[PDB]
Nanobody, 111 residues
Framework: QVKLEESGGGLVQAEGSLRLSCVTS????????VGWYRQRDVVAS??????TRYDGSAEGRFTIARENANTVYLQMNNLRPEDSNVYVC???????????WGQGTQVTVSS
């Protein structure tokens, strides 16, 4: 009953930037946390109180922010080839089906 749709990935050169966007639809009232995950290990997350959490590799280069009630983005600066990955948006809700996942977004960082 929560659906996630992702955009913003693609191909970029090293030291470039991307902004990944995750849009939620459905029963968003029960969402406790929205995050971006390396396809699943967390990169960054933002919870219902606005608290943000970053993995050590993201801290200082990436920023997660909530744009509105349905939209969370991850600004990725100073990308490196080792950052090439499929990134997936996840939402943690309260209840029996706790996790919802987006379709996944390819990020490729060229040398």
């Amino acid at each position: 009953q929560v659906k996630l749709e992702e955009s913003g990935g693609g191909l970029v050169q090293a030291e470039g930037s991307l902004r990944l966007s995750c849009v939620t639809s459905g029963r968003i009232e029960g969402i406790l946390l929205v995050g971006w995950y390396r396809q699943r290990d967390v990169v960054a997350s933002i919870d219902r109180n606005g608290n943000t959490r970053y993995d050590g590799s993201a801290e200082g280069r990436f920023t997660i922010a909530r744009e509105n009630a349905n939209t969370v983005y991850l600004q990725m600066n100073n990308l490196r080839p080792e950052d090439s990955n499929v990134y997936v948006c996840g939402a943690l809700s309260s209840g029996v089906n706790p996790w919802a996942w987006g379709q996944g977004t390819q990020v490729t960082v060229s040398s």
